[PDB]
Amino acid sequence: AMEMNYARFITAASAARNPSPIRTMTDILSRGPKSMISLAGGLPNPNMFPFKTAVITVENGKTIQFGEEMMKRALQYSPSAGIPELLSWLKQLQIKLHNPPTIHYPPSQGQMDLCVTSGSQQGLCKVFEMIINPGDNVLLDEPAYSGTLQSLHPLGCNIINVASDESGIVPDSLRDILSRWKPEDAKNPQKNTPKFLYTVPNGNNPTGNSLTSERKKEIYELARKYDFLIIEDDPYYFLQFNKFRVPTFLSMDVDGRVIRADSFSKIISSGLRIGFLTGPKPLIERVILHIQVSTLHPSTFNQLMISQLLHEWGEEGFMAHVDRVIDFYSNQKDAILAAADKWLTGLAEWHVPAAGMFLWIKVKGINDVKELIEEKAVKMGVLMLPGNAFYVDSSAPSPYLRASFSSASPEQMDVAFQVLAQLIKESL
Template sequence: MSPPTAIDIEAVTDTQAIVLPDPLTVNGVTSRRAKAGKLVAGTAAFTSSDFFKSPTSGKPKAKRWDHYLSLESKSRQPSSLKGAAQYLKNPGLISLGGGLPCAENFPIEELTVKVPSPPHFSERDTKESGRVLSAGKYDVSNGHSAYDLSIALNYGLGTGSAQMIRFVTEHTEIVCSPPYDDWQCSLTVGSTSALDQTYRIFCERGDYVLSEEYTFASAVETALPLGIRFAGVKIDEQGLLPESMDEILSNWNPEERGGARKPRVLYTVPSGQNPTGATQGTARRQAIYKVAQKHDIYIIEDEPYYFLQMQPYTGPNAAPVPPPANNEEFLKALIPTYLSMDVDGRVMRMDSFSKVIAPGTRVGWITASEQIVERFVRHNECSNQNPSGISQLVLYKMLDESWGHRGYLEWLIHLRLEYTRRRDVILAACEKYLPKEIVSWNPPAAGMFLWMKLDHTLHPLNGKVSLTELEEKIFLAAVDKGVLMSRGSWFTAERVNYVPHELFFRATFAAATEERMTEAIERFGTAVKESFGLVVNGDGNGA
């Protein structure tokens, strides 16, 4: 339906002259772009991260994954119509080939968004000093922009637009600097969709995927209808335990797993894991990567909360740690990604704008080796095609044309401090209102979740009812007091015949206002105390 038109980087007269520091910096992008010249990418332009990466000479190529590809994924062929795109480069050629509507029939003449001026990001500041960014229909042919409505409103290719691929490729290089040669990015319509597609690349019905024993419920529920089950790896306060992963893989017995072959894929949320809030440290990630190498495991690094890493928690009465003084300090404070240590090309990193800009954009991206990204893009072509062009245009205008990488990193620092503040509020409320003899928790270093363990052995009904029943009783008691928490059992990785042995609840500190969040924890504390018989009904405040 949408044959690509030509893309060119104008005026690349002396590529030898592009000598970039390693890793790429914000300034490096600026000088690189200046040398590369204006981005020219029209309607449904072919694009690739290769156009926008630093030269990677000397780095090894990624491992091939042919032996892991599913029948479905192996069967994907490029579209025959798209093959005709090669002729579009012929000068003067008129195409009656692809069924692309004409831009004159798009009834949107102009689009504007009002966004913050970095570093003044608050809603109040934005009202006062925000910038209004405007996109017209023909800004590209008028020379006003590298992206416009005539392009964004038409069909695009499965990678997403060249304009946004450039931005996310540069951003990924700044943050992750992958240590192998042939890495690529593709836009996604969000990580849940990307995960669905990735299961279909690597798994067949009957397969197991490894993950933390408590994990993102949607990851499990996306897998189950495909006949893919989760095998839960034991966790501690830093999340996934490499020893447990090694043990499961070393002793995998198909007979105990309904005939399932040894897992080939690990799904993990390394930072601010959902639901446990755990963040894997650098050494932990390195150890897990080694286990993955030992058992030839492909790693899905799902990182929606990576930039919701917070300031160190100093406790209720200590002075806060000063925020990062600049982008360089900020980047250094981030725990290294799996992608940054991926010498083999065995990682697919999933990034998303959902938690750092807004979920309603429905735009994210993956980074993986060329082979895997190509399979992923073939699937995009036969499903969601690419994210909304309107979303892509809004993101481009704000992130690329207005803020630039520097402003975007400043925004991420702003978010870091926002989430730090919210986390500190919920932790202060927990310190004040929860009975510590029953409820324990680890201060999260990233993400939006607080994972609370309740000592069920102290409950009067312990041993008399199942843990699941006990969990439900406490959940309903909390609802009765006016607070909704998520039940730990909703997040179990292993769903078949799973018998819980501990009692957890998950609270988010992302959504409610600070006052209501504090009020909610007080209510939960009352519900817990009453349920455990610490106080009688109606006398639960300020215990």
């Protein structure tokens, strides 16, 4: 256990955030009798709200019902970090799946803390705003999620690009990048050593490539040596195609240097906007205070829908669900790889996605696929995504295409790649 200095990863603005007056009140109300008349809060009267009951049908589960009182709770303000029954369910899930070393650490030493967020990306945006001053160095691997790049761009950090391949980030690249600094330079803020490494360790959007166990051990040792955070943005953790899931950065986080984002967006609902951050208490605390002044909390309604489903499923029923979803996406993956093999062998290069929704295709011989897709393929009713958007320099030419296998039938994929092959052939 290396002694962390979280002040180093919190901006002056972030550190200036004071606690809610609401929490001061609720703590006074606890040190005091339950038979209480409080006119001190700012809750509106929930009996004025026009939604009264809710019945919601479910796969392989008892129907979810909001009675009159539960509905009034669902329509009312709730805690910033999330409703307690969901938070505690999720805390038990994280202990079962990742058994983080930080569980029983003291708060100031990076004790594991959770925060339910309005989607996992709200969590990360908050994390990036917490950490980054202009001119700070951050590490990631291009191709990278376009949302992350669009989020980091206005913050004025320098993105130092780490090499990646079929197995995610190449730690051998990271090591060479870091040799620029001496390990002692982490103790000196004028030397400007990397604040963090961001990655999507399973099923990277857009590549489909997942890190291996061994590479995560190497990355963690480098993060320990040069004393940076690892931001583990892991929305396809529950869409891994291999039988045994790869150990997370969180699971090996002896130092309390890992902030993890989990997403319900591909397994439970994207539209509900319920994800969660898991990380060291001092950093999670900063994120929570920012949420207090922006969204206040994620939808109470949508949390109670998800929490009731998860409590009646149990961990067993939840993991049975993710297994059915993995099976679906694994068949879709096999279908798109078949269409790839049939139409693009000799015209394009690609790897087998280890997780997620995307096949990432390099077109041989064509420097920029943007003209082929946007001017020709579109007019023929086919579209894949040019790779341009997944690099910091998006105006640079890209031969790559991101192709989602989430929705399309085998009949549609076949047509799509036949058209692509035809267009590649008439462009060379």
